[PDB]
Amino acid sequence: MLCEIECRALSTAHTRLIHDFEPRDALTYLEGKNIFTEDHSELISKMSTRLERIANFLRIYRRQASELGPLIDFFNYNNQSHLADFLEDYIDFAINEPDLLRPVVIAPQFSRQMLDRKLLLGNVPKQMTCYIREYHVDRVIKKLDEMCDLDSFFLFLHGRAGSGKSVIASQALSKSDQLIGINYDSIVWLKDSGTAPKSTFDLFTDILLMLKSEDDLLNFPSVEHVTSVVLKRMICNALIDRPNTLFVFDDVVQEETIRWAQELRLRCLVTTRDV
Amino acid sequence: MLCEIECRALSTAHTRLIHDFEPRDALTYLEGKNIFTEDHSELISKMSTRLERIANFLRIYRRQASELGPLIDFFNYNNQSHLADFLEDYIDFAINEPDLLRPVVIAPQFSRQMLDRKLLLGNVPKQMTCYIREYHVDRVIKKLDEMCDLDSFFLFLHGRAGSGKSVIASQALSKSDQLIGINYDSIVWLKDSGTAPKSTFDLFTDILLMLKSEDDLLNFPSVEHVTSVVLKRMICNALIDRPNTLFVFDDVVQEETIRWAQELRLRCLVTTRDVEISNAASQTCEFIEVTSLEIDECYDFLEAYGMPMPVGEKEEDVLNKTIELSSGNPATLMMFFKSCEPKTFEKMAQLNNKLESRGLVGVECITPYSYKSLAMALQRCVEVLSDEDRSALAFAVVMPPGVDIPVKLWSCVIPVEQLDDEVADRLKRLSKRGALLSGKRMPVLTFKIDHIIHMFLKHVVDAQTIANGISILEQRLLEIETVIRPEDFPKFMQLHQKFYDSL
Amino acid sequence: MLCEIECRALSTAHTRLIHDFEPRDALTYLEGKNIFTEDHSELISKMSTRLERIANFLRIYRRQASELGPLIDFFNYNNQSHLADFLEDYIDFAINEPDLLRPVVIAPQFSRQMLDRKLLLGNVPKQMTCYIREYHVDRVIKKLDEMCDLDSFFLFLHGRAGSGKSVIASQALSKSDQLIGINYDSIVWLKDSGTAPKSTFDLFTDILLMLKSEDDLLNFPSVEHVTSVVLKRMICNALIDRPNTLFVFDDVVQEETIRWAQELRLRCLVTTRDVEISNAASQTCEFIEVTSLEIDECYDFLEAYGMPMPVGEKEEDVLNKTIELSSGNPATLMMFFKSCEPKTFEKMAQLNNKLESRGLVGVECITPYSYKSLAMALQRCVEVLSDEDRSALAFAVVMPPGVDIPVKLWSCVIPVLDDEVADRLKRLSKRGALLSGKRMPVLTFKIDHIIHMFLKHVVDAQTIANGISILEQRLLEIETVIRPEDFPKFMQLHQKFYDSL
Numbered sequence A: 001m002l003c004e005i006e007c008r009a010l011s012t013a014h015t016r017l018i019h020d021f022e023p024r025d026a027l028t029y030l031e032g033k034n035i036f037t038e039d040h041s042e043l044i045s046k047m048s049t050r051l052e053r054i055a056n057f058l059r060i061y062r063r064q065a066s067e068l069g070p071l072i073d074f075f076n077y078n079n080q081s082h083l084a085d086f087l088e089d090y091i092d093f094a095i096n097e098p099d100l101l102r103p104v105v106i107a108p109q110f111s112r113q114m115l116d117r118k119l120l121l122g123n124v125p126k127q128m129t130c131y132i133r134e135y136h137v138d139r140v141i142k143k144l145d146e147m148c149d150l151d152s153f154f155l156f157l158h159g160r161a162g163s164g165k166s167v168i169a170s171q172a173l174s175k176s177d178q179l180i181g182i183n184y185d186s187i188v189w190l191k192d193s194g195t196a197p198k199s200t201f202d203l204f205t206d207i208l209l210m211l212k213s214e215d216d217l218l219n220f221p222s223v224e225h226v227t228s229v230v231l232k233r234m235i236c237n238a239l240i241d242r243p244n245t246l247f248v249f250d251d252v253v254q255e256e257t258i259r260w261a262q263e264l265r266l267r268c269l270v271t272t273r274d275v
Numbered sequence B: 001m002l003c004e005i006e007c008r009a010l011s012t013a014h015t016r017l018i019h020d021f022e023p024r025d026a027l028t029y030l031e032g033k034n035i036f037t038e039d040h041s042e043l044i045s046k047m048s049t050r051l052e053r054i055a056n057f058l059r060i061y062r063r064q065a066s067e068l069g070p071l072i073d074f075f076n077y078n079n080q081s082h083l084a085d086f087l088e089d090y091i092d093f094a095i096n097e098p099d100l101l102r103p104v105v106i107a108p109q110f111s112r113q114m115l116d117r118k119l120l121l122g123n124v125p126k127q128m129t130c131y132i133r134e135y136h137v138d139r140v141i142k143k144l145d146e147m148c149d150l151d152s153f154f155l156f157l158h159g160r161a162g163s164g165k166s167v168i169a170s171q172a173l174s175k176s177d178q179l180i181g182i183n184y185d186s187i188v189w190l191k192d193s194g195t196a197p198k199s200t201f202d203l204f205t206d207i208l209l210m211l212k213s214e215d216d217l218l219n220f221p222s223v224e225h226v227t228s229v230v231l232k233r234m235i236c237n238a239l240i241d242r243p244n245t246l247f248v249f250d251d252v253v254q255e256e257t258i259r260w261a262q263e264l265r266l267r268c269l270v271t272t273r274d275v276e277i278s279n280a281a282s283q284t285c286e287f288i289e290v291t292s293l294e295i296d297e298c299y300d301f302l303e304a305y306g307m308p309m310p311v312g313e314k315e316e317d318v319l320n321k322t323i324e325l326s327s328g329n330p331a332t333l334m335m336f337f338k339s340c341e342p343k344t345f346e347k348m349a350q351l352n353n354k355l356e357s358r359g360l361v362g363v364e365c366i367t368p369y370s371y372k373s374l375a376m377a378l379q380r381c382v383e384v385l386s387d388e389d390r391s392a393l394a395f396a397v398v399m400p401p402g403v404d405i406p407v408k409l410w411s412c413v414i415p416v417e418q419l420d421d422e423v424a425d426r427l428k429r430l431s432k433r434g435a436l437l438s439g440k441r442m443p444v445l446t447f448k449i450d451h452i453i454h455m456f457l458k459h460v461v462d463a464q465t466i467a468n469g470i471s472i473l474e475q476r477l478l479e480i481e482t483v484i485r486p487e488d489f490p491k492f493m494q495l496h497q498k499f500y501d502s503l
Numbered sequence C: 001m002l003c004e005i006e007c008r009a010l011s012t013a014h015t016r017l018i019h020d021f022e023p024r025d026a027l028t029y030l031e032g033k034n035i036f037t038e039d040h041s042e043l044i045s046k047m048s049t050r051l052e053r054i055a056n057f058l059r060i061y062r063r064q065a066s067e068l069g070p071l072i073d074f075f076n077y078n079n080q081s082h083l084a085d086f087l088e089d090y091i092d093f094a095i096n097e098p099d100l101l102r103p104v105v106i107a108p109q110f111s112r113q114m115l116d117r118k119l120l121l122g123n124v125p126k127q128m129t130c131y132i133r134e135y136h137v138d139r140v141i142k143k144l145d146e147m148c149d150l151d152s153f154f155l156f157l158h159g160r161a162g163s164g165k166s167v168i169a170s171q172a173l174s175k176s177d178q179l180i181g182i183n184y185d186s187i188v189w190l191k192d193s194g195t196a197p198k199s200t201f202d203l204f205t206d207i208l209l210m211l212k213s214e215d216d217l218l219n220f221p222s223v224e225h226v227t228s229v230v231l232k233r234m235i236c237n238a239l240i241d242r243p244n245t246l247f248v249f250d251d252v253v254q255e256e257t258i259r260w261a262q263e264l265r266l267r268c269l270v271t272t273r274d275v276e277i278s279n280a281a282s283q284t285c286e287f288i289e290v291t292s293l294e295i296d297e298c299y300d301f302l303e304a305y306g307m308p309m310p311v312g313e314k315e316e317d318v319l320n321k322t323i324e325l326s327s328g329n330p331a332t333l334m335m336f337f338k339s340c341e342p343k344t345f346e347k348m349a350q351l352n353n354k355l356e357s358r359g360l361v362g363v364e365c366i367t368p369y370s371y372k373s374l375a376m377a378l379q380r381c382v383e384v385l386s387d388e389d390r391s392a393l394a395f396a397v398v399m400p401p402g403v404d405i406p407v408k409l410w411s412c413v414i415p416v417l418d419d420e421v422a423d424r425l426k427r428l429s430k431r432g433a434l435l436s437g438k439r440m441p442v443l444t445f446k447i448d449h450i451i452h453m454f455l456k457h458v459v460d461a462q463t464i465a466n467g468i469s470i471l472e473q474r475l476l477e478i479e480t481v482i483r484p485e486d487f488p489k490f491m492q493l494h495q496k497f498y499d500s501l
Ligand SMILES: Nc1ncnc2c1ncn2[C@@H]1O[C@H](COP(=O)(O)OP(=O)(O)OP(=O)(O)O)[C@@H](O)[C@H]1O
Pocket: A128, A129, A130, A131, A132, A133, A159, A160, A161, A162, A163, A164, A165, A166, A167, A168, A251, A271, A272, A273
């Protein structure tokens, strides 16, 4: 197999590999340098359009070669050297230097991305604006940054009632552009307020659905009736597709919540009154 | 069908079969060498993602082939020989040269981030960090390593209640990188705590689902209604796709569990309080007892959680009072800390009092324990007790705790010819079953009740039955230090007048 | 059509027919030698990949040719002679010699195959290891080997309760590698224990599912509601895919089971306590009785489980007391060990007492047995008993155990020429082996101790004393030696073993 660098190259130089190229031209040269099979060449060789032969050549290729050699050593011979030169240039601006791009910005306006889009979908409330508690929103954000490294952790933003804890979580996830995108990929903000004994399970029913794709909210089953061991397994399942995901649990009253959060190895911001 | 070796290989070499491979490529070569069917290839050939075609190819394959030949003889032809070479290497470090498989072909792919994936999915709890019981977590891991070879086996991590067994399994499967990946492929950790007769079946309903693929949890049927013979057959079925899989059964109370585990030929770690559930298994049973925390370990545990270490002599004593009271007990010790508020040696001694005049309820607190106080736990240990044994225990209140005392001196308070060995038989069952007592063969057959196991009974038995047992003692009490009490001096239990007047 | 030899060749030489070959090359040569059709060549000739043209050439070919000639006579002409030579070599190492491979081993480690895999899926229990009854597990296996030839047959591994029958079936199918793989292809081991009339049908519901593929356990219908004629037809249907399949029916109580087993033409191992269920079958019935553990085997069994062997004379005696008491019995013996706590010859003798003054309940313990004590088992063996026979048994309390005693001496306590007594006492040993028949010197039976302290703490405390009096009445009116008819007037020899009531 290749990797992200070698596959990012076949993708970046894609506007070009469409204007002038042909997989039939390379099939003979690759059945040869030992990177194909007589079904492989059959599959890519009998394709009505070229974008088909190209998409199959780039799919099949990324699996077969130990490296990106026998494709630079081909655009050369095929009078398509303006191609093998671009790709060799790209492999060099990474092979000879240990520095690139980090998680940052090169397609700007995270203003609808990190803001709008991710906040809204994670059910984060519309941050307060006319006064901001400097000290606190800052210290929250700081201690969250320190932890994006951690595998699972609790942050307790605890206080008096109406003391203002929940508003600060709104602001701490709404000021920076780092917490969402840079430090954590997604946000899930759920209000608890559970008092009944069925509440600590019902909560995690609506997490599981905060997770599930826009598709298959239709298929949402009578999950209403299914054991705790299963909702839990069913969640940490659907939780693979969610790299670094933050959980705000606005208003926890029951420590059973907290026990579930720790069985589910979650990353949690927690507003509560009882510490 | 394949087996655990041939299926453990398809699983070990899985990080790889995902990066470069395709079941469509192999379908033609296998409809051919006679190992598939025209529905088989249909089922794996029309699948949107490849991880689907791969998981179906590896599921369908493990059932169909008499061996793992026609898949090495394919990665070769498909220019994916870096694959068929790895698998042929693995099949060779098993038949000819044994042992060498784990050091050589299994370890060079360990990854401290893959464990966590496997731990989480096997529902393993978040191992403890601020103090680790060296000795035990080590010895657990050791005896598990010795057995990955074995086909099915029971490991009994048995102890007192709140004695800390379950935490150690969290750590023993969380320290090394060997137990998961090297010695066993996957983990399934399920909490039992079953009391009903439907519980031993319900357990194995949630195993079966601990096994089943992320796919077809949707299709999960009303399996809720289906015989025991079928859930059992249905499991050992879906158990093929699981080469070397470990089972932690946190908190077994019923020996029916243990009988199912042995019909299902499972590999089991077992935390329990009652040790005799092992008599259900006619098999490789090996044991590790979680003892009361030694006096030195208690210090370590205290320091670890910011607890101030002594200086003055009547301060190391304030702390020997806590260690004596919570007769070396993880769970109640923890409840103590959470409740030691100011941290002072002073407020630490305040509590030492609260413990004598309120039993365990003086320090009951919100703790990582499912239980507010050790009394909520022991409740159960006492319900399960033989009706006759429930009686024996109930009277052992009126003893001296932390004192080694003769059988006859016990024959006096305990209910029931001329030989009262029957007392001893009950007292053994009594230490075997929640470790409520304490047996000690020579110099002379004597038992002993600790303090945690005492202030339990103090604030729990009928206020009357305490005083009735005391009188029932002062009767037999007459009729004709590192030293046990002699038979010339039983007439006077008065040595412990101190620890008797406080009733 | 070809056959297994000629098709095994096209398969063995397959790694090769993929590296260099082409069905287009042979189509013309075969449309010719009369072995194809102009659709055949169309079907194999228009195929994108070659593994397609090859798999269709080898599928289509195996059906069409009377033999494997016109394919050796082709790799020759096609410069692929290194192929037609390999296949002609293979056809010769079978045509010129009458010997090959048998059902055996050439892909080794049946240790997960025959063992693990087939045993587990047939729901066979985890064989015992720390002691093996040599004689028996061996004789079981032997008589099973003799029969893999047979089309359907019953093997009755019958004995006392807790006498150890089921464990031996675990071992007899777990020692060898022959019984599973060599003699029989698969195993189905099902526990019966059926008492209701719906039980003999419910059993066969779970056979049918022991048979059904891993696929379509999902499709399992409400088979719960469907006639007996259909479950039966539905089974012997799904039973085609199962060449030489063995059935262990652990614990049959009802002879209706046995009638179904014989309508379904099954091959059955059968553990049971009541032996007469075999009269239900008009057939090859062969039997193996699990006797009480001989005195020497008891020693072996004790040592095997860390039990201390005698020295002093009144210590081998302490141990002959246990062996006498648990009148040689696997299950109650095991309960003893689990309960022998300190291991001392002393605490061993403590228990020897507890047994006389509390019956089997003195040593009841958690054991690999489904039962706390042998009394929980025997319960059933007694319920099943003919209403009249339940009576006969109930009185045999008032006998001397471990004593060979005459029929007339029994005619005294038993309800009703009194041969009728003997008839009941036979039914009684046949049906749970509660008694013990012994033809000459004179027709005498005998009750063991385990089969006694059962009745001791179980029959009406009154009926014991009433039978004793009912005896002292008839007792008058006119060692390796049986009691003579000149001396029946005095059952007083056993005053010792009588005063203890
Ligand atoms: N800029 C602000 N910062 C903090 N609190 C504010 C601000 N503006 C208004 N508030 C008051 O706080 C209310 C919401 O309080 P908030 O939810 O922050 O407290 P809380 O800690 O969540 O209380 P709870 O104990 O109910 O969780 C607002 O609607 C208003 O009454």
